[PDB]
């Protein structure tokens, strides 16, 4: 059975500065460090943080007086970050910087007054961090998941309406919606294209030419995390059967016996050894060695905090 590898895959630049954020905070100030939400939604890596003495927390009224607290890379909104600044803590902040960029355009309609559309899926912590940046009564912030979504909605003003993405989102679906926005709103403003942003993007390219050659696709990722889903969906989509897979041993037999090609990817928030670990699985059950596509080039690197270093 031919084992292939998605290029890119795997850690994205703000996945990998949010992880050295709280380890880091780790290294320097001891155990225990305050983390509001998981910093990144990948069950390996909370875990062993965990273990090192990071303690996850969704609300700020379960932090204690003078600890140090960091904000998840999936970012917050202001009045989480208002509630952190008025207690007794020490803030870091862990949000990629492709989520701050769509912060600052909300943060910039709402001072106006002015209504914005966030497209994105309900319930999920960049979601709710961006529509937090938004607080003014006589504008209006408000939600589309979908072109049905868009096709209900009104606002109180369609000659001052901008839009703006989650970074996670499926390129394909995304399209749709604007396609959408756009003849519902002609005036409406956004982007040349969308916010998400250059790994989802590259993930989701990458796992389309894997799908391609592959009859079965394995994606390393938790269950939620959104790009990591968006990987899986695109290939069962191209009429793959496609796994959202924590590690290894979560394989079942079944999904690959008699199989002679099977793709492998990763979304952000997955590091490399359980890729490793599942291709040494994938090798047990009659695999050969692990072939990488041909991909796009990655170069993009954030830097930590210099009172993190
Ligand atoms: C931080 C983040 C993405 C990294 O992957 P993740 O932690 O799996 O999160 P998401 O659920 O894909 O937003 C949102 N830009
Ligand atoms: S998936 Fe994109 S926006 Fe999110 S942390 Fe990674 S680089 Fe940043």
Known sequence: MQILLANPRGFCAGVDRAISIVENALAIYGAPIYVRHEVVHNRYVVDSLRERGAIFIEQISEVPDGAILIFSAHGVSQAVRNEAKSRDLTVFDATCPLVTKVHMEVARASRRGEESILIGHA?????????????????????????????????????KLSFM????????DTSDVIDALRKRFPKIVGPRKDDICYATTNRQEAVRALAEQAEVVLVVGSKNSSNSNRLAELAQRM????????????????????????????????????????????????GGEAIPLEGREENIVFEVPKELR
């Open 123 to 159: 319930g999920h912590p960049e979601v709710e961090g961006t529509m937090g940046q938004y607080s003014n009564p006589e504008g209006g912030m408000y939600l589309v998941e979908s072109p049905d979504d868009v096709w209900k909605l009104t606002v109180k003003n369609e000659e």
């Open 165 to 172: 993405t989650q970074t996670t989102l499926s390129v394909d």
């Open 239 to 286: 009429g793959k059967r496609a796994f959202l897979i924590d590690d290894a041993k979560d394989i079942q037999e079944e999904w690959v016996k008699e199989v002679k090609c099977v793709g492998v990817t990763a979304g952000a928030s997955a590091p490399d050894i359980l890729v490793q670990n599942v291709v040494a699985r994938l090798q047990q059950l009659g």
